[PDB]
Amino acid sequence: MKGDKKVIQHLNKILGNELIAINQYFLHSRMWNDWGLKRLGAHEYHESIDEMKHADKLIERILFLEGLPNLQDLGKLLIGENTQEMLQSDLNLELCATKDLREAIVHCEQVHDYVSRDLLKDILESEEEHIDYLETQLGLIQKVGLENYLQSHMHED
Amino acid sequence: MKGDKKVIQHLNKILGNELIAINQYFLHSRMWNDWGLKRLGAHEYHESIDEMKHADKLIERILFLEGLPNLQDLGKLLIGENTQEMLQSDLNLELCATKDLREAIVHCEQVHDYVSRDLLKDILESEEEHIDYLETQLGLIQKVGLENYLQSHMHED
Amino acid sequence: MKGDKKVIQHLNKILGNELIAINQYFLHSRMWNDWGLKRLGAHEYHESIDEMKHADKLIERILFLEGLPNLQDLGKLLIGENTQEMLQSDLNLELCATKDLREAIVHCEQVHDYVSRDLLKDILESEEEHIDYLETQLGLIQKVGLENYLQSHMHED
Amino acid sequence: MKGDKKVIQHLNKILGNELIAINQYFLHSRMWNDWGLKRLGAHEYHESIDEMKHADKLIERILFLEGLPNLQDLGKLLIGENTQEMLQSDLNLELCATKDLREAIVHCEQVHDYVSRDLLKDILESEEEHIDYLETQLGLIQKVGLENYLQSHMHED
Amino acid sequence: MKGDKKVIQHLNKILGNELIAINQYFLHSRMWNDWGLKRLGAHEYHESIDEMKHADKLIERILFLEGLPNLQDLGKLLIGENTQEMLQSDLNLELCATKDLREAIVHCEQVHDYVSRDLLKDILESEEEHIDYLETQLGLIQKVGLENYLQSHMHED
Amino acid sequence: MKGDKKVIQHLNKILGNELIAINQYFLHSRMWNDWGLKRLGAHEYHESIDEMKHADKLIERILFLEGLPNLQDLGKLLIGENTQEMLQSDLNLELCATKDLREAIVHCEQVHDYVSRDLLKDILESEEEHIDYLETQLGLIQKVGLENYLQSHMHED
Numbered sequence A, B, C, D, E, F: 001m002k003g004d005k006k007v008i009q010h011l012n013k014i015l016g017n018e019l020i021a022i023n024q025y026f027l028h029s030r031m032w033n034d035w036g037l038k039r040l041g042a043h044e045y046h047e048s049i050d051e052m053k054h055a056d057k058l059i060e061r062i063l064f065l066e067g068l069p070n071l072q073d074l075g076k077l078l079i080g081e082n083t084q085e086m087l088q089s090d091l092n093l094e095l096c097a098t099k100d101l102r103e104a105i106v107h108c109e110q111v112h113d114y115v116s117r118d119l120l121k122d123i124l125e126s127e128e129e130h131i132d133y134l135e136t137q138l139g140l141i142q143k144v145g146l147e148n149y150l151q152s153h154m155h156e157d
């Protein structure tokens, strides 16, 4: 097989994180929709779709490298019970995800798998953009108050 | 006459429920417009129109089955005095309506009037969607506060 | 409250007449459709819709004047059993309606509610147009014969 | 084979009913065209085509369930000698068809073949619409007289 | 009646052959579709439709000639169990059909029914085109092999 | 909570089945793409997307009924090693899925949750269409041979 065994392990680890995020964000989206917070529901749906696209790219890369993609192992979804908790749970997930991404990029560089590194760097940039969004939302709750913040997310853009 | 007599009684009971809802929702709509809560007035107008369309389908079915549509009996309207009472009154009415719809479907199934059952199931789905809307609105009043909730319904979409 | 109490009583009386006409004409429409007299069914549907629009305007005016619109009390629907009887019943209803309208306009003029008077005059003109239609139809039954008259109303325009 | 054997027997019974209706309605259509009653000929042609489409759906379902569609058995056509007999013969056929459809739906429900039930319910709704049309036509012959009724069906819509 | 009695018998015989072909080809079409041989299924559907159009023309001619079209008697459908057998069965049917057509044309010429002859000649040309198609398909099975032939008819044109 | 507790258990069981199918079909799709069987990869991708849409509808219904959607439990994926095993594994999964769907519909009917029944019937129809596709593909491998079947799925439609 052409792929480095540890690269493939790293890519399967990142894929596992994507699978958690897909489901966590999809459920959070539909919870916000059920509550009538449609702007949050829509944004979170798009985050879930973005993670689905990252998972696809990882699966394709693992197969090219002649590894076996692991879609069987689903780690812990941490579903919040209110908007603040859901935003914070998403942020905790992305803090974990970006740490694993950096560790994977280090190893790809070490064994000269520069195309896998580039793939992972693109995912990392996407996850840092999500962190920016999440930190901003939690900050806005403090600046405008929770009731106003939720009011501002009732109606879709 | 081709229709089952108890089917026709059930269809007239549902029709009676639709007639209450048409008038209650239409008056609630115009009360919201009078108060300047135009987004609530618009939504409630459309709920009234939807009930008018259900009444039409029931009337057509009753006549096909050679029954007499009952447009004469108008049950009690429970008109609320403020937004929270109006939403809750609509919700109470829909909970009664869906109970009667389920009882009518049971009977249609028993006598093999499958086309009447299908008509009633479509109405039931519409009324459950209205229950979803109403529970969501009452929840938003709690989450964003009454003053913000009303503010968000001043201007039309 | 800004409205004259007796004006509001008159407007609620007219509204009550509109509510009868809405339902009577809607059922007559669907009866003609069930019988295959689609041109009559279509015309009568449009009369029912026109009365719905008059009811809306009355409700809005009553609320502006700080009265309570009465959508609870539904008077007697007189449903005909054949085309001649249905046309005559509609005409009897409009004869009653136009008398109440004239009495309401007299009172509005007396207390200087000229905007309510104008609203009622517009409804009155609409109801006199319906009387013209109804008298014409009953006259055509005599001039062309009942069978030809019904034949001419089988197919929609 | 995946299909329930009695479900397949019921679907073939309905298919047999569709085959009678296709041929009876097609011949009635062309008889009306021969007589110059082109509006009746056109309507009846479309009824024949609708039955052809139902037969197609039944054939497809039977093959999916691994049964043998029965296009070989053609039951009795009851061809009328004049317009009133042809309409009544079509009505008699539809009353038989809807009885068999209800019996088939009962059995599908009992063995949990819910997709076959749904197919049959859609056919049933179509056949009840045809019953509505036929009863309406026979009623119009009484209301406008036979000669006027036929006159109204000379020219196409 | 204006028509020659034996001409009408011949036209009813041809009509009987069309009714067999309609059903045989329709079922063969849907069998090929069930098997995923969609190009064969589509071609055979169009053959069934073409026979339906021939049946229509025969019915119209028989009625003009003041005969009674026979849509009651359905002869034997010979449904094949695999592609080779279905193609050969269709060919056997067309060999029978074209013989009956030639015999009918002889009789039409004899009694000077030249318009019926022309109608039948047009049907005959259509059936010879179908024979050409069928012989060609059976020849291609021999030239390219059965597996390749079926492969080439999986996907629609 | 408005929902029947066993209805919610059934809806979560179906949701669990959808989650297995999403992942199994997505990986099978990308395995086919890796092997250059792009038409199979495309078809299987669309099957995965369809299951995603069913999962969405189930999640929305569970939340409306005030249950907790279970996106955490992922049952066993049975990933095939070649095309014939992958198709058969998908078929085995769909046979399990339709058994569970029928059991869920039985329960919904018993407790009068007719809107949940209708949702499940629509999913069931989709899964039976997939069974039709899968049985057809396995049949084509037998009819055209494995090498031809795979050749026919190299290039996209």
Ligand code: HEM
Residues within 6 Å of the ligand: B022, B023, B026, B049, B052, B053, B055, B056, B071, C019, C022, C023, C026, C049, C052, C053, C055, C056
């Ligand atoms: C038997 C009771 C009623 C029935 C069956 C009925 C039926 C209908 C139908 C079928 C429409 C057309 C809806 C569409 O296709 O969009 C309509 C429109 C409407 N209805 Fe009713 N209606 C009823 C009573 C009322 C009442 C009591 C009111 C007011 C107090 C009302 C107000 C209206 C208005 C404002 C419209 C829209 C008219 C327009 O097109 O401008 N309806 N109704």
Ligand code: HEM
Residues within 6 Å of the ligand: D022, D023, D026, D049, D052, D053, D055, D056, D071, E019, E022, E023, E026, E049, E052, E053, E055, E056
């Ligand atoms: C097994 C019995 C039959 C089946 C399943 C069948 C099926 C069909 C279908 C699916 C269509 C297309 C309809 C559409 O999508 O609009 C059609 C068209 C048609 N059928 Fe049939 N048919 C059957 C028998 C017959 C018979 C016995 C006749 C005449 C005696 C007939 C006359 C026609 C005609 C004239 C058309 C329209 C053709 C055109 O497009 O010009 N069919 N049929």
Ligand code: HEM
Residues within 6 Å of the ligand: A019, A022, A023, A026, A049, A052, A053, A055, A056, F022, F023, F026, F049, F052, F053, F055, F056, F071
């Ligand atoms: C809870 C599980 C999932 C749900 C509810 C879900 C839901 C959805 C929905 C609703 C769509 C839009 C479909 C449409 O309207 O066409 C979608 C698209 C998509 N999904 Fe999922 N999904 C799930 C898991 C996954 C997984 C695990 C993957 C990949 C391993 C995936 C890959 C994709 C892809 C590639 C798209 C198309 C994205 C695009 O528009 O470019 N999904 N998903």
Ligand SMILES: [K+]
Residues within 6 Å of the ligand: A148, A151, B148, B151
């Ligand atoms: K605010």
Ligand SMILES: [K+]
Residues within 6 Å of the ligand: C148, C151, D148, D151
């Ligand atoms: K006349």
Ligand SMILES: [K+]
Residues within 6 Å of the ligand: E148, E151, F148, F151
């Ligand atoms: K080949």
Ligand code: NA
Residues within 6 Å of the ligand: A132, A133, A135, A136
């Ligand atoms: Na930020």
Ligand code: NA
Residues within 6 Å of the ligand: B034, B035, C064
């Ligand atoms: Na005001």
Ligand code: NA
Residues within 6 Å of the ligand: A034, A035, A036, B132, B133, B135, B136, F064
């Ligand atoms: Na809700």
Ligand code: NA
Residues within 6 Å of the ligand: C132, C133, C135, C136
């Ligand atoms: Na006049």
Ligand code: NA
Residues within 6 Å of the ligand: D034, D035, E064
């Ligand atoms: Na003629």
Ligand code: NA
Residues within 6 Å of the ligand: B064, C034, C035, C036, D132, D133, D135, D136
């Ligand atoms: Na009727």
Ligand code: NA
Residues within 6 Å of the ligand: E132, E133, E135, E136
């Ligand atoms: Na040839």
Ligand code: NA
Residues within 6 Å of the ligand: A064, F034, F035
């Ligand atoms: Na490759």
Ligand code: NA
Residues within 6 Å of the ligand: D064, E034, E035, E036, F132, F133, F135, F136
């Ligand atoms: Na199949």
